[PDB]
Amino acid sequence: MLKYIIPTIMLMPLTWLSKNNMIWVNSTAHSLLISFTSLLLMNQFGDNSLNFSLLFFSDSLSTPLLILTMWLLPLMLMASQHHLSKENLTRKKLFITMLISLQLFLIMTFTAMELILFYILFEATLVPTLIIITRWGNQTERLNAGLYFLFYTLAGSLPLLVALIYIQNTVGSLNFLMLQYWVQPVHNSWSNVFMWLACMMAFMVKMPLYGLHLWLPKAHVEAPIAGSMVLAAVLLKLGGYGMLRITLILNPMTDFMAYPFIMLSLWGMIMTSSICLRQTDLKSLIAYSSVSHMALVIVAILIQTPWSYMGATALMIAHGLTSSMLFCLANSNYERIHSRTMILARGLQTLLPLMATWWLLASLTNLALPPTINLIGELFVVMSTFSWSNITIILMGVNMVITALYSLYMLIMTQRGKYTYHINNISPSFTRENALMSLHILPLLLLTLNPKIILGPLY
Amino acid sequence: YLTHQQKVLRLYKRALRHLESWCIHRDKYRYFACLLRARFDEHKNEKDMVKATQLLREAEEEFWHGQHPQPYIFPESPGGTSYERYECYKVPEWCLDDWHPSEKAMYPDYFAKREQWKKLRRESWEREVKQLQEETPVGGPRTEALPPARKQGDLPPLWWHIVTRPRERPM
Amino acid sequence: SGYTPEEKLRLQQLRELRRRWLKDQELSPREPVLPPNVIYKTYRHSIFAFTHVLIPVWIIHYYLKYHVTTKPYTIVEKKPRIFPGDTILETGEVIPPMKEFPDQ
């Protein structure tokens, strides 16, 4: 993994040593080259994973998440440079440096063998994240509202640290390869119930789980576009990636300890989709859309069948590209009207014809139109949870109806109908914006031709 | 809000249009249109406005009972089949500003005439703002009506978006 | 119940401008200034059949004959119906007739 760590670090000298007017050109060009070389990680095997060294490994789960992470850095740079153009030069380089350091922690996080090494990096990603959201965020409101920092660290980060420390004492190691052979069953015990919650609550909050999700809409309304892109696309998948790994050592206690979280996810899947129908803020609508989609991933991970793990991996990648594109589409409107209200500017298809095509494609993938990988992932989770209990088809089906409703409602409200009379500064879509959208959707649709490389290790 | 005189005439028009929806055939409609007209004529010269109001209220109750479930609606009227059919084709004039110079090079006469209008709008705006302020009582307007241009050379205040509104069949 | 004298005057003044504006939407004779019989129907159709039928079937036949049908069970025929009195091409077999029907 040093062939990706070292070039990523070298983006920092490159950014600080570029000519003043070349910082965006230089970093975007070279970060796209790192993204190109990330495709060499797809040297996967049917039986073994790609174990590079004592610290890092890659398997079919982390590999697609790594490629998505490395793809997103150039896209974030393209999306950020317009609104940072009035920023002074030293602050543009610090902003770029935060994004590079965020990628450095993410690629290391997804490949760490040792779960304690994963924990330190899994938390180090918050330092660049909060700095980006707060220092370049919209308002004076605190994303780390204090209550959320306390609840998360007390009920999430700290219990996970103690559980991991406890596990290594008992097992003698937290290397994930070792945990595959030395795993022992978890018997019923009040102490074991608390180990289970400790091992899972941190990832539940980051997913987020329904009932622990109110932080996510607040963060999106405050974050800059790059913040929303990384947060939606990857940072939520850190919780999903963590659960897919740590559930190896939690059986068979997950057989019953998962019921409350499945209930929260199955019900919260419908409650958050319905909320999307009465959202007045695009960024909030997309944020609640992510909660609904990540409810499927939690259910898939907790019932742990081969089909649900394949569906979970596909869902995480598909949502990453789709939710990121939706935030970029909303941001482009915001950069003209300077408001997140969804009802303010209407009938935009009349004024921006091609951008309306990007909107339609983003909405069709969001509502899981076949054969997009959005549906492939969602169908697999639906197929698996039907076996878990046939009644779930009712809740899964109803959510499919509602998801189509708010996806097209968002498309209809903003793109169709009569345009707003007094808004007279809607300039034609820039090449930068059109290319930003097409770099989201083309890879998303091309993956329909070869879905196996996003189906994870269970494939 | 309306006068009594307006409510009756609105009920006469609405009554006729629903009667036309029931009758369908022009001769049958013309027969009952004169029967209906006669009913109004029977009470044209009433003077007791208490009776006149009670006559109107009973008429409107009668209308609601005899109302047609599916009255005919002109295609382009609110609720008709063509209502707002061409809104997707109406592009506001300010969009021409953002045209590329190569796009404007295709219509040199049209765009020359368009700067003449934009010049006229500029030179007129200050005068329009004064005329409204001087003619406007203290406390703001009492109604939405707007005045005409008073002098030769002036343009009626607030005219651009009325004059340059999209055609009703833009494409 | 009609227009007040100012209402008519404002309407008249907006009529002049509105009608002048619409007259100005007409295009000049030069505008837009652009930058720089059986055989015909047969050629249009003949060239269409070639590009949109013959070439596609050449590619499809090549694809099916040499790439699809060379893999098992990719194109599965329903077996032809054999009726009594038939002659099998592969073996030369002769399917016997059916019994003599009773009169009807």
Binding site: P428 | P92, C95, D98, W99, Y110, M171 | E26, E31
Partner: peptide
């Protein structure tokens, strides 16, 4: 008579 059709800028 051929009239002008107001459209958004299609060039970009």
């Amino acid at each position: 008579k051929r009239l002008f059709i107001i459209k958004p800028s299609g060039f970009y």
